[PDB]
Short mmCIF file of C-alpha atoms and ligand atoms in Angstrom, two decimals:
data_model
loop_
_atom_site.label_atom_id
_atom_site.label_comp_id
_atom_site.label_asym_id
_atom_site.label_seq_id
_atom_site.Cartn_x
_atom_site.Cartn_y
_atom_site.Cartn_z
CA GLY A 1239 0.20 0.03 0.21
CA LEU A 1240 3.14 2.39 0.31
CA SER A 1241 4.37 4.53 -3.13
CA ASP A 1242 8.38 4.02 -4.07
CA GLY A 1243 8.33 7.69 -2.39
CA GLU A 1244 6.46 6.87 0.64
CA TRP A 1245 9.02 3.30 1.14
CA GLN A 1246 12.19 6.51 0.25
CA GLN A 1247 10.24 8.42 3.51
CA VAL A 1248 10.60 4.72 4.85
CA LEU A 1249 14.22 3.93 4.07
CA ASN A 1250 15.73 7.81 4.44
CA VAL A 1251 14.55 7.81 8.59
CA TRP A 1252 15.78 4.26 8.47
CA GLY A 1253 19.41 5.20 8.07
CA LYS A 1254 18.76 8.06 11.24
CA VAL A 1255 18.18 3.94 12.49
CA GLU A 1256 21.22 2.62 11.41
CA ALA A 1257 23.82 5.75 11.69
CA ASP A 1258 23.04 4.17 16.08
CA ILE A 1259 20.96 1.01 16.39
CA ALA A 1260 21.71 0.28 19.44
CA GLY A 1261 21.57 3.06 21.46
CA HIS A 1262 17.50 3.60 18.96
CA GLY A 1263 16.55 -0.37 19.88
CA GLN A 1264 17.32 0.65 23.91
CA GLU A 1265 15.15 3.42 23.76
CA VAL A 1266 12.73 1.52 21.58
CA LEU A 1267 12.39 -1.46 24.40
CA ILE A 1268 12.50 0.73 27.29
CA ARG A 1269 9.44 2.78 25.45
CA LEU A 1270 7.44 -0.63 25.06
CA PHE A 1271 8.25 -2.52 28.79
CA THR A 1272 7.40 1.20 30.18
CA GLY A 1273 4.64 1.43 28.84
CA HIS A 1274 3.20 -2.21 28.31
CA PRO A 1275 4.85 -3.90 31.44
CA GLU A 1276 3.47 -7.14 30.41
CA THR A 1277 5.68 -7.20 27.39
CA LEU A 1278 8.64 -7.28 30.10
CA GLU A 1279 7.08 -11.04 31.28
CA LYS A 1280 8.17 -12.10 28.02
CA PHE A 1281 11.16 -11.91 28.10
CA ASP A 1282 13.34 -13.81 31.33
CA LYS A 1283 16.56 -12.89 30.63
CA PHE A 1284 15.26 -9.35 31.18
CA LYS A 1285 13.05 -11.16 35.25
CA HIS A 1286 16.16 -8.55 36.83
CA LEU A 1287 15.37 -5.51 35.50
CA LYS A 1288 12.66 -3.52 37.70
CA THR A 1289 13.33 -0.03 37.13
CA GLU A 1290 13.61 2.46 34.00
CA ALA A 1291 16.67 2.88 35.52
CA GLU A 1292 18.00 -1.17 35.60
CA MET A 1293 16.87 -0.94 32.43
CA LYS A 1294 18.48 1.28 30.79
CA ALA A 1295 22.44 0.78 32.77
CA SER A 1296 21.26 -3.34 31.12
CA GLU A 1297 23.72 -4.47 28.42
CA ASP A 1298 21.46 -7.29 27.09
CA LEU A 1299 18.84 -5.13 26.60
CA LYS A 1300 20.51 -3.11 24.65
CA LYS A 1301 22.69 -5.75 22.33
CA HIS A 1302 18.77 -7.33 22.22
CA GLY A 1303 17.33 -3.92 20.67
CA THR A 1304 20.50 -3.84 17.92
CA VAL A 1305 18.97 -7.66 16.94
CA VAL A 1306 16.01 -6.91 17.08
CA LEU A 1307 16.52 -3.00 15.02
CA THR A 1308 19.20 -5.01 13.19
CA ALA A 1309 15.99 -8.09 11.67
CA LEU A 1310 13.75 -5.04 11.35
CA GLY A 1311 15.63 -2.70 9.34
CA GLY A 1312 16.36 -6.13 6.53
CA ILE A 1313 12.47 -6.90 6.37
CA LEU A 1314 11.43 -3.52 5.94
CA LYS A 1315 14.22 -2.75 2.60
CA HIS A 1316 13.37 -6.51 1.24
CA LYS A 1317 10.02 -5.48 1.98
CA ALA A 1318 10.24 -2.24 -0.74
CA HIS A 1319 12.80 -4.12 -3.37
CA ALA A 1320 9.95 -7.03 -3.68
CA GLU A 1321 7.16 -4.11 -3.80
CA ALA A 1322 8.81 -1.47 -6.36
CA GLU A 1323 8.85 -4.91 -8.53
CA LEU A 1324 5.42 -6.65 -8.24
CA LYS A 1325 3.61 -3.41 -8.59
CA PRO A 1326 3.98 -3.11 -12.34
CA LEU A 1327 3.34 -5.91 -13.12
CA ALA A 1328 0.41 -6.28 -11.55
CA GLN A 1329 -0.31 -2.82 -12.26
CA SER A 1330 0.37 -4.01 -16.47
CA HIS A 1331 -1.72 -7.40 -15.78
CA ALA A 1332 -5.03 -6.08 -14.01
CA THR A 1333 -5.73 -2.91 -16.06
CA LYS A 1334 -3.83 -2.87 -19.22
CA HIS A 1335 -3.67 -7.07 -20.20
CA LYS A 1336 -6.76 -7.86 -18.59
CA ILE A 1337 -4.92 -11.60 -17.30
CA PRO A 1338 -7.43 -13.01 -15.14
CA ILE A 1339 -6.06 -15.93 -12.05
CA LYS A 1340 -6.88 -18.39 -14.31
CA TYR A 1341 -4.08 -17.88 -17.10
CA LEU A 1342 -2.04 -17.36 -14.62
CA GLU A 1343 -2.11 -20.46 -13.16
CA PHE A 1344 -2.00 -22.44 -17.30
CA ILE A 1345 1.24 -20.51 -17.38
CA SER A 1346 2.63 -21.48 -13.89
CA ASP A 1347 1.50 -25.67 -14.77
CA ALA A 1348 3.79 -24.51 -18.57
CA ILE A 1349 7.11 -23.96 -16.61
CA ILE A 1350 6.07 -27.18 -14.58
CA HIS A 1351 5.74 -29.24 -17.58
CA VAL A 1352 8.75 -27.23 -19.65
CA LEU A 1353 11.17 -28.07 -15.94
CA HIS A 1354 9.56 -31.35 -15.14
CA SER A 1355 10.74 -31.90 -19.74
CA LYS A 1356 14.11 -30.32 -19.61
CA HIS A 1357 15.50 -31.44 -16.50
CA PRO A 1358 14.13 -34.59 -14.58
CA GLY A 1359 16.99 -35.68 -13.06
CA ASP A 1360 17.06 -31.91 -11.83
CA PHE A 1361 13.07 -31.67 -11.00
CA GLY A 1362 12.50 -34.98 -8.74
CA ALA A 1363 8.97 -35.20 -7.08
CA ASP A 1364 10.46 -32.67 -4.12
CA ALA A 1365 11.62 -29.72 -6.65
CA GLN A 1366 8.82 -30.13 -8.88
CA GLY A 1367 6.70 -29.63 -5.31
CA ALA A 1368 8.82 -26.51 -4.81
CA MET A 1369 7.94 -24.77 -7.54
CA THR A 1370 4.08 -25.31 -7.66
CA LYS A 1371 4.14 -24.09 -4.15
CA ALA A 1372 6.64 -21.33 -4.93
CA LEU A 1373 4.59 -20.42 -8.50
CA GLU A 1374 1.22 -21.01 -5.81
CA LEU A 1375 2.26 -17.24 -3.14
CA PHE A 1376 3.76 -16.17 -6.72
CA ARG A 1377 -0.24 -16.13 -7.68
CA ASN A 1378 -1.93 -15.41 -4.25
CA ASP A 1379 0.87 -12.04 -4.58
CA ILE A 1380 -0.76 -10.71 -7.02
CA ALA A 1381 -4.57 -11.79 -7.02
CA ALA A 1382 -3.63 -9.47 -3.59
CA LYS A 1383 -2.70 -6.61 -5.74
CA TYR A 1384 -5.75 -6.92 -8.47
CA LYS A 1385 -7.97 -6.60 -5.26
CA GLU A 1386 -6.46 -3.91 -4.38
CA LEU A 1387 -6.60 -2.58 -7.36
CA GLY A 1388 -10.75 -3.70 -7.80
CA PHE A 1389 -10.06 -5.46 -10.86
CA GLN A 1390 -11.88 -9.28 -10.59
CA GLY A 1391 -8.59 -11.34 -11.57
CA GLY B 1030 5.20 -21.58 3.04
CA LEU B 1031 8.66 -23.47 1.75
CA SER B 1032 11.06 -24.80 3.66
CA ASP B 1033 15.24 -23.58 3.47
CA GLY B 1034 15.67 -27.01 1.07
CA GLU B 1035 12.56 -25.46 -0.78
CA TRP B 1036 13.27 -22.23 -1.29
CA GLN B 1037 17.07 -23.49 -2.35
CA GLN B 1038 15.95 -26.41 -5.14
CA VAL B 1039 13.51 -23.43 -5.91
CA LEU B 1040 17.31 -21.20 -7.73
CA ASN B 1041 19.27 -24.11 -8.01
CA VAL B 1042 16.47 -24.80 -10.86
CA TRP B 1043 16.26 -21.45 -12.00
CA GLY B 1044 19.80 -21.19 -12.54
CA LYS B 1045 19.12 -24.09 -15.62
CA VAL B 1046 16.47 -22.17 -16.87
CA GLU B 1047 19.23 -18.69 -16.97
CA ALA B 1048 21.58 -20.55 -18.66
CA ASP B 1049 19.24 -21.22 -22.05
CA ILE B 1050 16.42 -18.28 -20.29
CA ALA B 1051 15.60 -17.86 -24.68
CA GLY B 1052 15.52 -21.47 -25.25
CA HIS B 1053 13.14 -22.66 -21.47
CA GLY B 1054 11.10 -19.21 -22.78
CA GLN B 1055 10.10 -20.51 -26.15
CA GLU B 1056 9.16 -24.19 -24.66
CA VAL B 1057 6.61 -22.02 -21.71
CA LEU B 1058 4.85 -19.82 -23.28
CA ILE B 1059 4.16 -22.97 -26.09
CA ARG B 1060 2.82 -24.79 -23.85
CA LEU B 1061 0.88 -22.91 -22.68
CA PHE B 1062 -0.29 -21.38 -25.34
CA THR B 1063 -0.89 -25.27 -27.16
CA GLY B 1064 -2.43 -26.04 -23.91
CA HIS B 1065 -4.91 -22.96 -23.74
CA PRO B 1066 -5.53 -21.37 -26.35
CA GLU B 1067 -7.14 -18.69 -25.63
CA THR B 1068 -4.18 -17.77 -24.15
CA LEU B 1069 -2.82 -17.13 -27.76
CA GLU B 1070 -6.20 -14.57 -28.41
CA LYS B 1071 -4.37 -12.43 -24.62
CA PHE B 1072 -0.71 -11.11 -27.65
CA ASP B 1073 -2.50 -8.75 -31.01
CA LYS B 1074 1.67 -10.21 -32.25
CA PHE B 1075 1.35 -14.39 -31.88
CA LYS B 1076 -2.58 -14.58 -31.92
CA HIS B 1077 -2.05 -15.44 -35.76
CA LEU B 1078 0.10 -18.62 -34.69
CA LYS B 1079 -1.44 -21.87 -35.47
CA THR B 1080 1.43 -24.82 -34.90
CA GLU B 1081 4.90 -25.12 -32.14
CA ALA B 1082 7.17 -25.14 -35.73
CA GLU B 1083 5.29 -21.29 -36.25
CA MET B 1084 5.45 -20.67 -32.65
CA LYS B 1085 9.23 -21.46 -32.14
CA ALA B 1086 10.14 -19.61 -35.69
CA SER B 1087 8.61 -16.65 -34.10
CA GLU B 1088 11.19 -13.97 -33.10
CA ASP B 1089 8.55 -12.09 -30.93
CA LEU B 1090 7.07 -15.25 -28.67
CA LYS B 1091 11.40 -15.88 -27.78
CA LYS B 1092 11.62 -12.13 -26.63
CA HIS B 1093 8.23 -12.29 -24.41
CA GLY B 1094 9.38 -16.11 -23.29
CA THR B 1095 12.43 -14.19 -22.08
CA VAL B 1096 10.55 -11.16 -20.40
CA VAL B 1097 8.50 -13.48 -19.04
CA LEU B 1098 10.97 -15.29 -16.63
CA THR B 1099 12.93 -13.25 -16.67
CA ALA B 1100 10.61 -10.95 -14.30
CA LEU B 1101 10.15 -14.41 -12.38
CA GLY B 1102 13.00 -15.19 -12.08
CA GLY B 1103 14.08 -12.23 -9.81
CA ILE B 1104 10.28 -12.15 -8.66
CA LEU B 1105 10.69 -15.26 -6.52
CA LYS B 1106 15.12 -14.87 -5.79
CA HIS B 1107 14.03 -11.85 -3.99
CA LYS B 1108 10.46 -14.12 -2.29
CA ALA B 1109 13.73 -16.74 -1.55
CA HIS B 1110 15.56 -14.41 0.46
CA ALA B 1111 12.91 -12.47 2.14
CA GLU B 1112 11.84 -15.36 4.12
CA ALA B 1113 14.80 -16.86 5.18
CA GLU B 1114 14.03 -13.75 7.39
CA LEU B 1115 10.37 -13.71 7.98
CA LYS B 1116 10.11 -17.70 8.35
CA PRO B 1117 12.59 -17.65 11.23
CA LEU B 1118 11.02 -15.48 12.94
CA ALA B 1119 7.56 -16.34 13.03
CA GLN B 1120 7.77 -19.85 13.90
CA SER B 1121 10.38 -17.92 17.37
CA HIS B 1122 7.94 -15.87 17.79
CA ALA B 1123 4.91 -18.57 17.69
CA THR B 1124 6.39 -21.36 18.79
CA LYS B 1125 9.09 -20.47 21.64
CA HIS B 1126 7.95 -16.78 22.98
CA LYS B 1127 4.70 -16.64 22.09
CA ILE B 1128 3.86 -13.18 21.28
CA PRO B 1129 1.07 -12.19 20.22
CA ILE B 1130 0.46 -10.50 17.38
CA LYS B 1131 -1.21 -6.87 19.83
CA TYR B 1132 2.77 -6.46 21.33
CA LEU B 1133 3.89 -6.04 17.87
CA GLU B 1134 1.40 -3.03 17.98
CA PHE B 1135 2.90 -2.18 21.34
CA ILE B 1136 6.26 -2.66 18.73
CA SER B 1137 6.10 -0.77 17.07
CA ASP B 1138 3.83 2.21 19.02
CA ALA B 1139 7.34 2.65 19.84
CA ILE B 1140 8.86 2.39 16.98
CA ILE B 1141 7.12 5.11 15.72
CA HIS B 1142 7.29 7.23 18.86
CA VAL B 1143 11.36 7.15 19.11
CA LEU B 1144 11.84 7.69 15.24
CA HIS B 1145 9.46 11.06 15.46
CA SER B 1146 10.92 11.95 18.62
CA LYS B 1147 14.75 11.58 16.93
CA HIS B 1148 14.61 12.75 13.78
CA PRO B 1149 11.88 15.16 13.34
CA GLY B 1150 13.39 16.94 9.62
CA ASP B 1151 12.35 13.21 8.97
CA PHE B 1152 9.54 11.60 9.91
CA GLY B 1153 6.56 14.56 9.17
CA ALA B 1154 2.67 13.42 9.05
CA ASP B 1155 4.03 11.75 5.40
CA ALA B 1156 6.65 9.51 6.50
CA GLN B 1157 5.21 8.42 10.40
CA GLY B 1158 1.39 7.05 7.06
CA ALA B 1159 4.58 5.47 5.66
CA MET B 1160 6.11 4.63 8.15
CA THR B 1161 2.70 3.26 10.17
CA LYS B 1162 1.43 1.30 6.98
CA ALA B 1163 5.48 -0.07 6.42
CA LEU B 1164 5.55 -1.56 10.37
CA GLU B 1165 2.09 -2.72 9.74
CA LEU B 1166 2.79 -4.62 6.25
CA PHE B 1167 5.40 -6.46 8.55
CA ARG B 1168 2.93 -7.30 11.60
CA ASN B 1169 0.44 -8.99 8.06
CA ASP B 1170 2.99 -11.03 7.00
CA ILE B 1171 3.81 -12.03 11.26
CA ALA B 1172 0.07 -13.05 11.31
CA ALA B 1173 -0.20 -14.52 8.57
CA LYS B 1174 2.79 -17.12 9.21
CA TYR B 1175 0.71 -17.11 12.64
CA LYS B 1176 -2.18 -18.59 10.65
CA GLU B 1177 -0.46 -21.33 9.30
CA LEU B 1178 1.38 -22.01 12.44
CA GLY B 1179 -1.71 -22.28 14.44
CA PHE B 1180 -0.35 -20.24 16.77
CA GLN B 1181 -4.00 -17.65 17.78
CA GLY B 1182 -1.68 -14.60 18.24
C1 HEM C 729 9.93 -6.10 15.50
C2 HEM C 729 9.91 -6.90 16.04
C3 HEM C 729 10.28 -8.38 16.35
C4 HEM C 729 11.69 -8.19 16.32
C5 HEM C 729 11.76 -7.51 15.02
C6 HEM C 729 11.64 -8.99 16.76
C7 HEM C 729 13.22 -10.04 16.46
C8 HEM C 729 13.67 -10.20 17.09
C9 HEM C 729 14.93 -11.54 17.44
C10 HEM C 729 15.83 -11.31 15.67
C11 HEM C 729 15.29 -12.20 17.68
C12 HEM C 729 16.13 -13.32 18.53
C13 HEM C 729 15.78 -14.30 16.93
C14 HEM C 729 14.10 -14.89 17.54
O1 HEM C 729 14.99 -15.88 18.31
O2 HEM C 729 13.57 -15.16 16.45
C15 HEM C 729 14.04 -12.37 18.63
C16 HEM C 729 14.46 -12.72 19.53
C17 HEM C 729 13.36 -12.26 21.31
N1 HEM C 729 11.92 -11.34 20.93
FE1 HEM C 729 11.78 -11.05 19.28
N2 HEM C 729 11.01 -9.86 17.95
C18 HEM C 729 10.03 -8.85 17.89
C19 HEM C 729 9.44 -8.27 18.47
C20 HEM C 729 9.28 -9.05 20.25
C21 HEM C 729 8.06 -8.53 20.34
C22 HEM C 729 7.25 -7.69 21.24
C23 HEM C 729 8.37 -9.19 21.94
C24 HEM C 729 7.58 -9.57 23.11
C25 HEM C 729 6.73 -8.84 24.11
C26 HEM C 729 9.62 -9.93 21.43
C27 HEM C 729 10.07 -11.09 22.41
C28 HEM C 729 11.40 -11.43 22.57
C29 HEM C 729 12.38 -12.99 23.49
C30 HEM C 729 11.10 -12.87 24.21
C31 HEM C 729 12.69 -13.17 22.45
C32 HEM C 729 14.10 -13.84 22.58
C33 HEM C 729 14.90 -13.42 23.47
C34 HEM C 729 16.33 -13.39 23.97
O3 HEM C 729 16.86 -14.76 25.50
O4 HEM C 729 17.43 -14.60 23.49
N3 HEM C 729 9.81 -10.10 20.69
N4 HEM C 729 13.45 -11.12 19.09
C1 HEM C 730 4.65 -15.49 -14.37
C2 HEM C 730 3.64 -14.71 -15.06
C3 HEM C 730 3.67 -13.68 -16.38
C4 HEM C 730 4.49 -12.99 -15.90
C5 HEM C 730 6.43 -12.57 -14.84
C6 HEM C 730 4.73 -11.98 -17.18
C7 HEM C 730 5.83 -9.91 -17.50
C8 HEM C 730 5.46 -9.70 -17.65
C9 HEM C 730 5.93 -8.80 -18.38
C10 HEM C 730 7.23 -7.97 -17.59
C11 HEM C 730 6.00 -8.23 -19.98
C12 HEM C 730 6.28 -7.03 -20.32
C13 HEM C 730 6.15 -5.69 -18.93
C14 HEM C 730 4.33 -5.82 -19.02
O1 HEM C 730 3.49 -4.56 -20.14
O2 HEM C 730 4.15 -5.79 -17.38
C15 HEM C 730 3.87 -8.61 -20.02
C16 HEM C 730 3.65 -8.31 -21.28
C17 HEM C 730 2.25 -9.10 -21.11
N1 HEM C 730 1.89 -9.87 -20.73
FE1 HEM C 730 2.78 -10.73 -19.29
N2 HEM C 730 3.45 -11.78 -17.51
C18 HEM C 730 3.16 -13.53 -16.68
C19 HEM C 730 1.74 -14.10 -17.54
C20 HEM C 730 0.75 -13.70 -18.32
C21 HEM C 730 -0.64 -14.77 -18.59
C22 HEM C 730 -0.28 -16.01 -17.95
C23 HEM C 730 -0.33 -13.40 -20.04
C24 HEM C 730 -2.01 -13.83 -20.69
C25 HEM C 730 -2.24 -15.75 -20.93
C26 HEM C 730 -0.01 -12.63 -19.96
C27 HEM C 730 0.28 -11.28 -21.06
C28 HEM C 730 0.70 -10.27 -20.88
C29 HEM C 730 0.59 -9.58 -22.59
C30 HEM C 730 -0.23 -9.45 -23.08
C31 HEM C 730 1.24 -8.19 -22.79
C32 HEM C 730 1.91 -7.71 -23.36
C33 HEM C 730 2.82 -8.46 -24.50
C34 HEM C 730 3.46 -6.61 -25.43
O3 HEM C 730 2.57 -6.64 -25.53
O4 HEM C 730 4.20 -6.30 -26.20
N3 HEM C 730 1.20 -12.22 -19.48
N4 HEM C 730 4.64 -9.61 -19.12
O1 O C 731 12.47 -9.66 20.63
O1 O C 732 3.33 -11.86 -20.36
#
């Protein structure tokens, strides 16, 4: 649901996070724990942290903050990149070409057929099952954008 | 979703596709158009081709097959890399840490507050709206993985 400009805005502020990932992560976890103490109960390794001051002093709360924001930064970058790639394809296939999801199923079946035909050795039952699932995820991704665009696929 | 091995099987067969992307593209569209002749009617430049032999001689069809498989390969590779990060997070937060979606909402609130507090210049109302949508996409992705695992979240 984000424009390329909106994802640039998300990644722009994320650059500022990366300038001090530990400080940001410490501040996020302390905001979370102080506002919603029930969340701190989920962290058995932080049972010794009672006060804001103990939280601020904690070497491991700060290290965990880095772990959380490092993971979330990677996820946001990869989501921005996927969207910029998928959105125009979904746009053209909904609005210009008007390709039903059934037709995307036909081409998916055609891809599996050609890979089985050309690579029987390296495309056995397990690999064919993997590709079958991956192509269904792709179709589902397109189908979700078709519904956002109001196109009945 | 795919297991880690299933994603690697997809990447491995896609390397074979890329080693002869022209031939794979041709064979995929020929299979689509022969199995499902209604699909050919979408392609102004091809809809006149009757036989596999004619389809194979069409430089236009060959060109298009390469465009299709290039686009799909990028989508598959990006999904594989993204799922490598999201799958294990969802798995640990469902089955080991038992983190409800409403606590990912709490930490999202904290992230948005901390960014606004530290970086007001890079976190105006529009950039805040973008980051709010982006963290909602992250939580919905985790929610969908939670539903797959049967974790109420
Ligand atoms: C932006 C949201 C979040 C991200 C990206 C995130 C990421 C991570 C990562 C990367 C780890 C270490 C690897 C793992 O076990 O999967 C972790 C551990 C953990 N997370 Fe999260 N987390 C998030 C939200 C939460 C919330 C809201 C809670 C609790 C209320 C939580 C509880 C935990 C716990 C208990 C651990 C184990 C920590 C330990 O004992 O070392 N997570 N998290
Ligand atoms: C794996 C599935 C598919 C992929 C990755 C894909 C990719 C593409 C790409 C990259 C283009 C050129 C850029 C664009 O217009 O978006 C395109 C064009 C097109 N696609 Fe698809 N496509 C897929 C499935 C289909 C199917 C199943 C059909 C029809 C049955 C279809 C019909 C078209 C048409 C008619 C065009 C315009 C052709 C032209 O004017 O040159 N696509 N496709
Ligand atoms: O976390
Ligand atoms: O296509």
